[PDB]
PDB file of C-alpha atoms and ligand atoms in Angstrom:
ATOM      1  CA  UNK W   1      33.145 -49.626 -23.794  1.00 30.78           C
ATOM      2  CA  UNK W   2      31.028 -46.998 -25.872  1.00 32.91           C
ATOM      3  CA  UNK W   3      27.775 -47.319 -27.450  1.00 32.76           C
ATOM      4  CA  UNK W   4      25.419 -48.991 -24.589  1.00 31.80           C
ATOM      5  CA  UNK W   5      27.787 -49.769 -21.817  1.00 33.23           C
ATOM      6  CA  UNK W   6      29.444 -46.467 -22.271  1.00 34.65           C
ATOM      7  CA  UNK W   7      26.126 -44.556 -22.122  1.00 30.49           C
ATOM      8  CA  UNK W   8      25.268 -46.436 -19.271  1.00 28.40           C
ATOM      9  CA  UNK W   9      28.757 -45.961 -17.833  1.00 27.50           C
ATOM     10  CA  UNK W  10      28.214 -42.231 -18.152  1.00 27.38           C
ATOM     11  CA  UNK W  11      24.616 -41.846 -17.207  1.00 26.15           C
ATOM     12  CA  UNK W  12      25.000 -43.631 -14.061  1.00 23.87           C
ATOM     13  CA  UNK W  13      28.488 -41.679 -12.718  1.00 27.85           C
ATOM     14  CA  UNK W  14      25.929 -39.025 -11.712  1.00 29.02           C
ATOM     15  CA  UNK W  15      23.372 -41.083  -9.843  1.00 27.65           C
ATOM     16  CA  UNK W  16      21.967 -39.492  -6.872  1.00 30.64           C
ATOM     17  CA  UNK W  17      23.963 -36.423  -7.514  1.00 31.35           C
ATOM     18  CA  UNK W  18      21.726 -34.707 -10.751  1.00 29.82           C
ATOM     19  CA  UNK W  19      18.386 -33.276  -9.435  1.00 29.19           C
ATOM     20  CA  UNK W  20      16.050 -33.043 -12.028  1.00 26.56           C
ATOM     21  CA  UNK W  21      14.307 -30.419 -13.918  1.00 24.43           C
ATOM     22  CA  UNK W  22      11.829 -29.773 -16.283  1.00 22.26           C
ATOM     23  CA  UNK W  23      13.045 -28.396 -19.589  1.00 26.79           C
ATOM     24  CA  UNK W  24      16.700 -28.744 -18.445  1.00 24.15           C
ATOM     25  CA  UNK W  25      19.744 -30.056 -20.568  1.00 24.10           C
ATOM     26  CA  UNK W  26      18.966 -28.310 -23.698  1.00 28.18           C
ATOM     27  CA  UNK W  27      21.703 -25.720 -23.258  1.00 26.17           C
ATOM     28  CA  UNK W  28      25.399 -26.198 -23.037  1.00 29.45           C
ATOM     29  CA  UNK W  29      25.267 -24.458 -19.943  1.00 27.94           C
ATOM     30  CA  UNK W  30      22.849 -27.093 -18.656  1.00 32.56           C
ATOM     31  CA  UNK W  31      24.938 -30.314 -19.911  1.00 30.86           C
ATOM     32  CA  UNK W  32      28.013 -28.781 -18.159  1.00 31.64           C
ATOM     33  CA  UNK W  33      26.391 -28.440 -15.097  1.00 29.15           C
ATOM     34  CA  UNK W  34      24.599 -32.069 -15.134  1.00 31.10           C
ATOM     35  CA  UNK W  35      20.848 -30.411 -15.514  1.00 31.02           C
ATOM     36  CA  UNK W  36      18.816 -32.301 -17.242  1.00 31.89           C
ATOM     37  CA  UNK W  37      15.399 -34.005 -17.550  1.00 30.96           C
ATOM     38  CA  UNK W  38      13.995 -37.395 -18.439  1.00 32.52           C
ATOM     39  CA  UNK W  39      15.036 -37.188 -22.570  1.00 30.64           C
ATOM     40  CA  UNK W  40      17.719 -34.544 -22.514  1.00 29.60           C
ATOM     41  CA  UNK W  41      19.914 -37.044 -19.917  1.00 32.69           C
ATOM     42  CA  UNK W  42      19.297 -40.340 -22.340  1.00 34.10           C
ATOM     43  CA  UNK W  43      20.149 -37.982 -25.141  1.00 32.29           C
ATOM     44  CA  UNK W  44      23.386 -37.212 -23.190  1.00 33.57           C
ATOM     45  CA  UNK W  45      24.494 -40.080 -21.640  1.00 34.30           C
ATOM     46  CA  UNK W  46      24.404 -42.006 -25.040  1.00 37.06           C
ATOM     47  CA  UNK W  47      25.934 -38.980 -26.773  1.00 39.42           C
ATOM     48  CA  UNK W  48      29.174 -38.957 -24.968  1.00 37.30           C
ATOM     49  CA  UNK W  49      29.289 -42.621 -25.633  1.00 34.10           C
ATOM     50  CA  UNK W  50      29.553 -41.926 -29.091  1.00 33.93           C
ATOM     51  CA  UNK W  51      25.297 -42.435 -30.248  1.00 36.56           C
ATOM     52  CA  UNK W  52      23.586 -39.216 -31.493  1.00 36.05           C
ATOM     53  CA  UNK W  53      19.973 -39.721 -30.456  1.00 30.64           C
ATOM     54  CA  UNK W  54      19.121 -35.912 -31.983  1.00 32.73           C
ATOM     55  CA  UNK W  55      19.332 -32.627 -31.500  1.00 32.04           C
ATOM     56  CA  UNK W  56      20.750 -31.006 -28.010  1.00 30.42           C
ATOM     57  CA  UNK W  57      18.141 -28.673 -28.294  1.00 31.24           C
ATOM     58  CA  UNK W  58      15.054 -30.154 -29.518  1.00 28.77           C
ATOM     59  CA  UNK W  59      15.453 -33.627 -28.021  1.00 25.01           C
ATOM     60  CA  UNK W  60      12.627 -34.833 -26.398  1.00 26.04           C
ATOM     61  CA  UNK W  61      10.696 -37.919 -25.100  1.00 21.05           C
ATOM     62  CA  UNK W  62       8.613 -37.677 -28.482  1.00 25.00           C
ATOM     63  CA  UNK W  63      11.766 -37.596 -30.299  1.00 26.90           C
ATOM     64  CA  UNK W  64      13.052 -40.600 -28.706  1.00 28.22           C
ATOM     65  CA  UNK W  65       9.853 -42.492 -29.456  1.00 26.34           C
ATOM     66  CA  UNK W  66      10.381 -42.371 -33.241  1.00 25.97           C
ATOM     67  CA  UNK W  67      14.332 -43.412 -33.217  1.00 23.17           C
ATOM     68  CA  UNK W  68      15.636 -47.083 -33.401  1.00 22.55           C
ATOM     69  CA  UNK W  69      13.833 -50.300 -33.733  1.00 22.15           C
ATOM     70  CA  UNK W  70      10.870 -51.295 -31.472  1.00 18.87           C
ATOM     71  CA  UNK W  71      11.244 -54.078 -28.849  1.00 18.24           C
ATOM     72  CA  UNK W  72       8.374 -56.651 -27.487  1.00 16.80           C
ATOM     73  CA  UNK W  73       8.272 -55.743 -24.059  1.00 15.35           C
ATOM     74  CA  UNK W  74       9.262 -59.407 -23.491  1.00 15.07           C
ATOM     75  CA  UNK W  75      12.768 -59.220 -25.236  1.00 15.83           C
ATOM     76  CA  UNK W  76      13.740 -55.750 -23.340  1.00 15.32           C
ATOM     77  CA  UNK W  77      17.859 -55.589 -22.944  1.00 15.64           C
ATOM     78  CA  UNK W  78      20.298 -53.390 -21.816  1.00 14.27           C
ATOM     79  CA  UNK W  79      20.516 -50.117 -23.621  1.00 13.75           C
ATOM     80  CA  UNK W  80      17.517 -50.373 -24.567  1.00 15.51           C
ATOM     81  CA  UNK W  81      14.627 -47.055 -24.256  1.00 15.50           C
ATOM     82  CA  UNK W  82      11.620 -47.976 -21.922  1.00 13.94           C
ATOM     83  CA  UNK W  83       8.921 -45.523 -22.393  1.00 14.21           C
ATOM     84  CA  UNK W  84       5.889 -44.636 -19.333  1.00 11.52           C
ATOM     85  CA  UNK W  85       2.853 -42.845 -19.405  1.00 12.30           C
ATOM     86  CA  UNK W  86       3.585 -40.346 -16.618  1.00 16.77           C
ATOM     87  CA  UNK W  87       2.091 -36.832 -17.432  1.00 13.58           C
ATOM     88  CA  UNK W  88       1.288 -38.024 -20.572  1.00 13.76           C
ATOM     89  CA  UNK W  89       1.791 -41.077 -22.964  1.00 15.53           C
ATOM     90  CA  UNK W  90       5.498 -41.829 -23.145  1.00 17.88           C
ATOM     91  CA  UNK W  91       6.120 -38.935 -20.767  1.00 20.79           C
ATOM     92  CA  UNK W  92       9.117 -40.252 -19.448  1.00 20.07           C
ATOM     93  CA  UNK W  93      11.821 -42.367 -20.400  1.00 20.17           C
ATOM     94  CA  UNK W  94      15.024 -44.228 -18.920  1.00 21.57           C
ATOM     95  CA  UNK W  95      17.577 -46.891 -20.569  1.00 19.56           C
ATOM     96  CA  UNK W  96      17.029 -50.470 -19.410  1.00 16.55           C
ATOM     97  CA  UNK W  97      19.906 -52.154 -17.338  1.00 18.33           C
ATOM     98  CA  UNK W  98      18.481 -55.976 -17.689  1.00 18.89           C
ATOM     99  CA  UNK W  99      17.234 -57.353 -14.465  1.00 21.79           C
ATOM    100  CA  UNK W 100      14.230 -55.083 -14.214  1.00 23.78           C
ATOM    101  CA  UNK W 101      15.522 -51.862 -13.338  1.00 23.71           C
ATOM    102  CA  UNK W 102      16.306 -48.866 -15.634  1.00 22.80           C
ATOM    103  CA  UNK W 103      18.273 -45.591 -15.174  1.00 23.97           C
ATOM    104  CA  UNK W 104      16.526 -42.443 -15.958  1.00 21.40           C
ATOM    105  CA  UNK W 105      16.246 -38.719 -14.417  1.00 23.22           C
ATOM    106  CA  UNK W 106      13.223 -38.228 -12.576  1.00 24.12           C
ATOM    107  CA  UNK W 107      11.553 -35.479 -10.322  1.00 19.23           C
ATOM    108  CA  UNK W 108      11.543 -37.932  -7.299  1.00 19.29           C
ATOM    109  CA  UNK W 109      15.249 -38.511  -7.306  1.00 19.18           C
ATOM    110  CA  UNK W 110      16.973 -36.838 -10.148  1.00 21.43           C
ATOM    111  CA  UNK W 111      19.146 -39.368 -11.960  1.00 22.64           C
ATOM    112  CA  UNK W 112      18.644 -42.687 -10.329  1.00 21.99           C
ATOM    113  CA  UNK W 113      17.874 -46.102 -11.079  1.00 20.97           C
ATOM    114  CA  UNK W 114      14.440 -47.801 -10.902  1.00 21.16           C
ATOM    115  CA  UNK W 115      12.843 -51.053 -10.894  1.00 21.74           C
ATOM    116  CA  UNK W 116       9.973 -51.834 -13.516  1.00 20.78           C
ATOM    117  CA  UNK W 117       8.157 -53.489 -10.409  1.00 20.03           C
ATOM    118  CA  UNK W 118       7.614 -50.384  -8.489  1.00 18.61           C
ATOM    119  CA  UNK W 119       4.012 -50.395  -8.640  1.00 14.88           C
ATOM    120  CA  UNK W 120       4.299 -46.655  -9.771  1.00 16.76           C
ATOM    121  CA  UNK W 121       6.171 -47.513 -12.941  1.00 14.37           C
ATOM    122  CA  UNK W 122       4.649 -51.189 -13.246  1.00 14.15           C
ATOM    123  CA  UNK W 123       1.377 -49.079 -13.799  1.00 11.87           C
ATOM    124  CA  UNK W 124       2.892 -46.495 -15.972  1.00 14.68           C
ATOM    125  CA  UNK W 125       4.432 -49.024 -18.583  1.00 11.59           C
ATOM    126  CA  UNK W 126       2.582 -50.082 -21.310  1.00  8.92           C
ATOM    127  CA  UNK W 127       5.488 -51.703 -23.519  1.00  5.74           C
ATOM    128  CA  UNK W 128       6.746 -49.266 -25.552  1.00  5.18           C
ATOM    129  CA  UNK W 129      10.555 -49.926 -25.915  1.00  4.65           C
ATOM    130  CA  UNK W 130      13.002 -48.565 -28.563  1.00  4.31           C
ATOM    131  CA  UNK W 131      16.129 -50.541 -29.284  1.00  4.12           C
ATOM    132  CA  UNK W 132      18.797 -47.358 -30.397  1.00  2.57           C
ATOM    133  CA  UNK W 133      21.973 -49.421 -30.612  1.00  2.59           C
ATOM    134  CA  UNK W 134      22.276 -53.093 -32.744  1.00  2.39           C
TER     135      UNK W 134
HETATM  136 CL1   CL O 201      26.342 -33.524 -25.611  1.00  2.00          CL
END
């Protein structure tokens, strides 16, 4: 009940109810008040579920990028980081649920979940994927 499920547990009991924003979730203020962007809400949804994915403060999609193990994109599982080129390469990121969709906080929809076969993200991914839990 921690570790993946947990993060996802917690990351998705604020689906459709977090608007997004840029630079948000850094401050204690912010994670109180469920503000966050893309990296700062994977950072806490897998921090209250016991995983320390870095630094509150200096957290970011970059960050991400360089902690756990990569992943073919063929052998993506739940829990696992899925990285898109957005704004720039690996500008955004979300945790993969299995069954092509992923949960992430996005300007569109603040925390929601996706599906890799949105043409939108289908385009954007390029299979970068981080595995953070064994
Ligand atoms: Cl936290």
């Amino acid at each position: 009940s921690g570790g993946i499920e947990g993060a996802i547990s917690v990351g998705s009991s604020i689906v459709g109810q977090s608007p997004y924003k840029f630079g948000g979730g850094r401050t204690q203020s912010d994670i109180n008040n469920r503000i966050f962007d893309c990296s700062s809400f994977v950072r806490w949804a897998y921090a209250s579920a016991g995983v320390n994915l870095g630094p509150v403060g200096g957290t970011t999609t970059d960050t991400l990028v360089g902690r756990g193990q990569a992943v073919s994109a063929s052998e993506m599982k739940r829990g696992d980081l899925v990285f898109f080129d957005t704004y720039k390469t690996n500008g955004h990121v979300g945790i993969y649920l299995g069954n092509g969709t992923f949960l992430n906080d996005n300007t569109s929809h603040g925390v929601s979940v996706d599906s890799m076969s949105n043409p939108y993200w289908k385009a954007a991914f390029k299979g970068v994927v981080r595995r953070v839990v064994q």
